[PDB]
Amino acid sequence: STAGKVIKCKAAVLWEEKKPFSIEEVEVAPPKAHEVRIKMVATGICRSDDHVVSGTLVTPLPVIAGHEAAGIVESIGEGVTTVRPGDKVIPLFTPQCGKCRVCKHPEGNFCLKNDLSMPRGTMQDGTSRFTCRGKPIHHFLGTSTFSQYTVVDEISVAKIDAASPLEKVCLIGCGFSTGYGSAVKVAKVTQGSTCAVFGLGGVGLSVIMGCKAAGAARIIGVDINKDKFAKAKEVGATECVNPQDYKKPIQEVLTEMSNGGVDFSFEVIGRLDTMVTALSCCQEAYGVSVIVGVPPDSQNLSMNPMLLLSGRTWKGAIFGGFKSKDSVPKLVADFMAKKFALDPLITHVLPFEKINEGFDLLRSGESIRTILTF
């Protein structure tokens, strides 16, 4: 009955960097051809949304952020074939158009229609479905989930299991899938290996889940916040180290612990120095290091190419290397089948209008994932 009409609803608008989110009355346009309007049910607070606030991650402002979510389709634009009204869906911050060179490649997942490489903060058609007091508000990675309703391109939404618990499976829209995929698909962690995981937030915990599932014998968590260690150990870390405890660099510590370097290292923080440390701590001849952390805007790292010439492999990935539309439904089905657990990532559940409390919890170190419910 809202189909074909403007919806007036509340959304959390970020007007300016380094300011609180502002709960505003917005108008959400109806979906145009090949667009889907979604009623949000749950959205997760991911450190990448905080990067927008901090200016680490540049995207046009003002913006409705939020990219880790699950909802129900309220209506569909002309030509939509992959979802219908009433369907449970997860928005895909990495699209899967199915037609570009990457979508056709067996391994690649970074679809050329993504709004990550050179963010415009629009729909695919280069316009916005959001207005606040006459002013257009930017989209974020084609998702924009910090709103009661959003509009996404059909290539940026997957239908999921009609019985799935949206307050849990929203994590499959980013943090779980990124971390788990980084281990099982990108690194391809092997049985009996030694893994080091830098950063023990939601995404690093999911890296640990991935390494345990892949049969790693040793999984060393690294965090400057020792409060993170207990939960890292619960999901499979065999050991945890705090670099602040040591009078020498942690790559030397991890090299001695691993008897000459780890098989697999993961940077899951977003700092240039830990990207180089994670590479250095993997074994010089056959080690693999995966960058998961989003670096600070426009900054270059410095590294010695002899770390690679010896044999190391260095790679990164978006969304755990998962082809998003193909994988997100299968990951939900796997969750429904008890193949992995999401409750260990969820430390707080707040109503949407307490979003700023949700971000305060993240910034303080006290949360892993806060889920915002509608």
Ligand X SMILES: OCc1ccc(Br)cc1
Considering the complex, what minimum distance in angstroms separates the CB of residue 328 from a second copy?
18
User: Binding pattern to Zn ion, positions 67-106, x when CB under 5 A?
Assistant: ------------------------------x--x--x---
139 classed as catalytic = no
Q: What is the token pair recorded at 207?
A: 């890296």
User: What whole-number distance in Å separates Cα of residue 3 and Cα of residue 84?
Assistant: 12
Tracing tokens 């030509």 back to the chain, one arrives at: 79
User: What whole-number distance in Å separates Cα of residue 160 and Cα of residue 98?
Assistant: 18
Strand ranges for 146-284 from DSSP E: 149-153, 157-159, 194-198, 218-222, 239-241, 264-267
Residue 9 annotated as part of some ligand binding site = no
- The residue annotated as part of the active site, out of 9, 170, 174, 282, is 174
34 classed as catalytic = no
Which residue among 31, 71, 119, 199 contacts ligand NAI (CB under 6 A)?
Answer: 199
First vs last Cα of the chain: how many Å apart?
Answer: 20
Which residue among 46, 83, 332, 361 contacts ligand X (CB under 6 A)?
Answer: 46
If contact means CB under 5 to 8 A according to the sort of partner, which of ligand NAI, a second copy, Zn ion, none does residue 97 touch? Zn ion
When asked if residue 318 is in the footprint of Zn ion (CB under 5 A), the reply is no
- Residue 29 has phi, psi (to 5 degrees) of -60, 155
When asked if residue 46 is in the footprint of Zn ion (CB under 5 A), the reply is yes
Nearest-5° Cα angle at 235, 234 to 240: 70
195 classed as catalytic = no
User: What whole-number distance in Å separates Cα of residue 370 and Cα of residue 372?
Assistant: 6
Which residue among 66, 95, 119, 175 contacts ligand NAI (CB under 6 A)?
Answer: 175
If contact means CB under 5 to 8 A according to the sort of partner, which of a second copy, ligand NAI, Zn ion, none does residue 107 touch? a second copy
Contact 273, 198 (CB under 8 A): no
Which residue among 319, 322, 335, 359 contacts ligand NAI (CB under 6 A)?
Answer: 319
Separation in Å, CA 357 to CA 25, 66, 146: 20, 15, 14
Amino acid at 190: T
User: Binding pattern to ligand NAI, positions 218-237, x when CB under 6 A?
Assistant: ----xxxx--x---------
When asked if residue 327 is in the footprint of ligand NAI (CB under 6 A), the reply is no
Q: Which residues are catalytic, by number? A: 46, 48, 51, 67, 174
Q: Which residues bind Zn ion (CB under 5 A)?
A: 46, 48, 97, 100, 103, 111, 174
